Amino acid sequence: SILKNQEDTFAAELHRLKQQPLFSLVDFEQVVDRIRSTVAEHLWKLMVEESDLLGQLKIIKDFYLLGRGELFQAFIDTAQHMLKTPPTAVTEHDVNVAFQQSAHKVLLDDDNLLPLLHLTSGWAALGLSYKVQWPLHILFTPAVLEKYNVVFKYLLSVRRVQAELQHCWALQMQRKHLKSNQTDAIKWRLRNHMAFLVDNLQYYLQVDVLESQFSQLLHQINSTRDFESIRLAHDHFLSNLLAQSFILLKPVFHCLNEILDLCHSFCSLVSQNLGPLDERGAAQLSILVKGFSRQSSLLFKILS
């Protein structure tokens, strides 16, 4: 550091300040600002380059804001007991075992052992903890990993419901397939296409919501050389993720969670039904189609 090298200069300024018989703000500001610039530069000189700040942000984004898609498809495929209630006596070990096993499937032979899967169903109690290098990064506090994990759990729920609906689509593939099949209740007015759309569109929205700020935040860090500026940029990044992802307490957020559980009930019915068969699905189906129309009217409150 050049802190010791310019130590005597700042010492001369503060020694000059005591000899002066008058207190003025104009000089006192100048000494504290001149010290502040170089010390924030001293932090910035280490954190960006030898701690790989720009490099660690992509790791955070990949494992955490669901910037990767291989692990978070392979994990939900090989987990079947986190849909049920966990006793949290066997499952808390089993989730990280399954996590590292699923990460082993394609690549990831370089480390990927820093995360930990903790349990407090078992999806809503699943939590990812990512311990950071605390002397080499004080930008990553306990509070920011706390906000970050709220983002993690909400995006996992969306991932589950859309994977369910796209896998349960096999009308074309198996059920009309060398089959003739009289269809007047075998069709459900094909609302499977509609329930895709309300999960698809939000989805595309998320691709903007991550990428516009993430491109900006790896840009601002390049321009400035004081760590204090990067703190403001990061504290705008987090609030933008929260507000644009609609996580904030609204009637709209309650509506989105209701959309999600409604899609899960749709997926359960069409999973259990089978290829063409009547098992008194009509009652649950009627409740479902009326409820979907009711909630689709509520999403027009924002459109007006």
Partner 1 sequence: REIITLQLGQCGNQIGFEFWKQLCAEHGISPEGIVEEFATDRKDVFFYQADDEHYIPRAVLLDLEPRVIHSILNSPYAKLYNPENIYLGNNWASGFSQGEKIHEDIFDIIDREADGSDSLEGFVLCHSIAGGTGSGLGSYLLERLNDRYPKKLVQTYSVFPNQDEDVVVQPYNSLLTLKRLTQNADCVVVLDNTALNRIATDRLHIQNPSFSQINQLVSTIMSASTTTLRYPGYMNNDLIGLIASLIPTPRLHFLMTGYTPLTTDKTTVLDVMRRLLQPKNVMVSTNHCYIAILNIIQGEVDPTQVHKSLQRIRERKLANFIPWGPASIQVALSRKSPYLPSAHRVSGLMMANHTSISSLFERTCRQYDKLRKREAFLEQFRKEDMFKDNFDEMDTSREIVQQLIDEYHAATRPDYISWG
Residues in contact with partner 1 by CB under 8 A are 66, 68-70, 73, 101, 104, 106-107, 166-167, 169, 171-174, 176-178, 193, 196-197, 200, 203-204, 207-208, 211-212, 215
Report, in Å, the least distance between residue 104 CB and partner 1.
7
Q: Of the two residues 211 and 279, which places its CB atom closer to partner 1 in the complex? A: 211
Nearest distance from C-beta of residue 87 to partner 1, angstroms: 27
Which residue's entry shows tokens 């090989």?
Answer: 78
With a CB cutoff of 8 Å and minimum separation 6, the contacts of 17 are 27, 28, 31
* In contact, 285 and 188? CB cutoff 8 Å: yes
Cβ 55 to partner 1 shortest distance, Å: 14
- CB nearer to partner 1: give 91 or 213: 213
Q: ∠ CA 167-173-176 to the nearest 5 degrees?
A: 125
**Choice between 38 and 273, CB closer to partner 1:** 273
Pick the closer one to partner 1 by CB: 78 or 268: 78
d(CA 21, CA 32) in angstroms, rounded, equals 19
By beta-carbon proximity to partner 1, the closer residue of 10 and 188 is: 188
- Collapsing DSSP to helix, strand or coil, 272 comes out as helix
Q: Which residue has the tokens 């207190």?
A: 23
Q: Is 92 in a helix, a strand, or coil? A: helix
Is 126 within 8 Å of 117 (Cβ atoms)?
yes
